[PDB]
């Protein structure tokens, strides 16, 4: 009944994205420093 912007998960997903918390594999970040060359 309530509008999507007011109760929607995807709108929370915009304001708090999962990408704001990086998660790399050891294949790309073996040294745990964000892929620093």
Partner 1 sequence: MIMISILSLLLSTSVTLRRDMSILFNRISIIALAYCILHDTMSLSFISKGIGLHGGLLHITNLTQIFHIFIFIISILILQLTSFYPRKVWIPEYSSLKDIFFNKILYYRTKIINKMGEHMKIIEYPLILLFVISGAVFLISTNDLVSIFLSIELQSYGLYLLSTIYRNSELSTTGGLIYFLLGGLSSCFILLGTSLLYVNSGTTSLDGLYILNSISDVNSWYKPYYLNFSLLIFSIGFLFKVSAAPFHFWSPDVYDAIPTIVTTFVAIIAKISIFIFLLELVYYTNSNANSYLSEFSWTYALLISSLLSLIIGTVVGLTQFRIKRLLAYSTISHVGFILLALSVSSIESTQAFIFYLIQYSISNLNAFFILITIGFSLYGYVTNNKEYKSLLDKNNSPIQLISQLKGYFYINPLLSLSLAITIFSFVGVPPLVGFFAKQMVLSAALDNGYIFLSLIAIITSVIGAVYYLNVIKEIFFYSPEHEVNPVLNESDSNFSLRILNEKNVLIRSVLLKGRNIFISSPFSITISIITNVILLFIFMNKEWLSMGTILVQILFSA
29 vs 10: CA distance, rounded Å: 29
Is 21 a binding residue for partner 1 by CB under 8 A? The answer is no
Residue from the set 10, 16, 20, 34 that interacts with partner 1 by CB under 8 A: 16
8 binds partner 1 (CB under 8 A): no
17 makes contact with partner 1 (CB under 8 A): no
| Token digits of residue 23 | 């998660």
Place of tokens 């304001």: 15
Positions that interact with partner 1 (CB under 8 A): 1-3, 5-7, 11-12, 15-16
């Amino acid at each position: 009944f309530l509008p999507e912007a007011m109760v929607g998960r995807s709108k929370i997903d915009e304001k708090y994205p999962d990408s704001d918390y990086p998660t790399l594999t050891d294949k790309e970040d073996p040294d745990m420093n964000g892929g620093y060359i």
